[PDB]
């Protein structure tokens with residue numbers, strides 16, 4: 001099937017907005033990780049393929065996804081990176097887990113519909 005950018009944005013943007021609405025939990029995910037600002041220069045030794053909400057938002061806004069599993073893949077990549085890098089008891093790991101819980105709840109019915 002061919003998916004138009006407007007269809008994807010209408011269907012998928014509410015699921016992205018649901019992540020942004022989580023406060024405080026979305027705060028570490030709203031911009032690309034900046035290891036120098038954050039004082040964690042080993043970050044890219046661990047995380048090879050960075051992703052964050054702003055990047056995903058821009059891709060949706062500008063029609064860069066052809067089909068919805070591409071969007072799902074980027075959201076999951078963002079979560080997977082944070083679970084890999086951050087320690088289990090850390091704030092940012094737990095914030096990731098909250099976003100992932102919200103995302104699965106939102107995305108399941110949307111993908112069923114398309």
Ligand SMILES: CC(=O)N1CCc2c(c(Nc3cccc(C(=O)NC(C)C)c3)nn2CC2CC2)C1
Pocket residue numbers: 024027028029033038039040081082085086091092
């Ligand atoms: C997403 C990710 O894995 N990050 C790496 C770890 C990481 C990231 C961020 N970014 C970030 C950026 C903005 C706000 C926050 C935040 O947690 N604020 C709360 C105290 C409400 C966090 N903070 N940290 C922890 C800092 C290094 C000790 C971003």
